[PDB]
């Protein structure tokens, strides 16, 4: 059991990774541009794309969220309930 691309790390999340970041009543998509695995608890680097990234939002995995079709449903859920006429 281990990723080809190289040594499996700890942590549940990779630099690359695409994950999606909440602070309110709507989902909003963030990625990962690196991680530090040196470590556990630790402090992940995370920026949300179509802004400048030398904003630098740290946050712990705790604030992350895995990228899946269901947590893609739940946005698309909450999307459809926040329309409204």
């Given at each position: 059991?281990?990723?080809?691309?190289?040594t499996?790390?700890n942590?549940?999340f990779?630099d690359?990774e695409r994950?999606?970041?909440?602070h309110?009543?709507?989902i909003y998509?963030a990625?990962?541009l690196?991680?530090?695995?040196?470590?556990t608890?630790?402090?992940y680097?995370?920026?949300?794309?179509?802004?400048?990234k030398?904003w630098?939002?740290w946050?712990p995995?705790?604030?992350?969220?895995?990228?899946?079709d269901?947590?893609?449903?739940?946005?698309?859920?909450?999307?459809?309930q926040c329309?409204?006429?």
């Amino acid at each position: 059991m281990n990723y080809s691309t190289g040594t499996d790390a700890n942590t549940l999340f990779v630099d690359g990774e695409r994950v999606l970041c909440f602070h309110g009543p709507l989902i909003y998509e963030a990625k990962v541009l690196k991680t530090k695995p040196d470590a556990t608890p630790v402090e992940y680097y995370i920026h949300y794309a179509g802004w400048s990234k030398n904003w630098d939002e740290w946050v712990p995995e705790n604030r992350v969220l895995k990228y899946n079709d269901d947590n893609v449903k739940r946005r698309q859920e909450l999307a459809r309930q926040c329309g409204e006429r």
